[PDB]
Design a binder for this molecule. Structure first.
Ligand code: HEM
Length: 79
């Protein structure tokens, strides 16, 4: 089974709501990670409420197995 969310995810851009992102068709609630993001949370927050792809494309440091499995710990469902 799968918890399915619509892209309209876009409302989850703060702690009060939860900070969510997508990667592929997967949805992640990354609220508890953000302050630990390398260089700080503000860069990560550029992607809040939407897909990581347009941002991660410029930052190939995310293209590591450990990063992908780290993100997977925050999965909540799918689009
Ligand atoms: C939920 C989203 C994100 C997660 C889970 C994530 C996770 C990570 C992790 C684990 C690293 C360190 C990798 C390593 O050095 O081995 C990293 C580094 C970095 N991330 Fe992200 N990232 C996210 C979003 C973003 C976004 C949206 C941007 C850009 C707009 C970004 C820019 C960077 C940069 C610049 C670094 C390098 C920092 C440094 O070494 O100074 N990240 N990220």
């Amino acid at each position: 089974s799968t918890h399915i969310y619509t892209k309209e995810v876009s409302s989850h851009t703060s702690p009060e709501t939860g900070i969510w992102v997508t990667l592929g068709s997967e949805v992640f609630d990354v609220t508890e990670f953000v302050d630990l993001h390398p260089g700080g949370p503000s860069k990560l927050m550029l992607a809040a409420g939407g897909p990581l792809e347009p941002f991660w494309a410029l930052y190939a440091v995310h293209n590591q197995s450990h990063v992908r499995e780290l993100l997977a710990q925050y999965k909540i469902g799918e689009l």
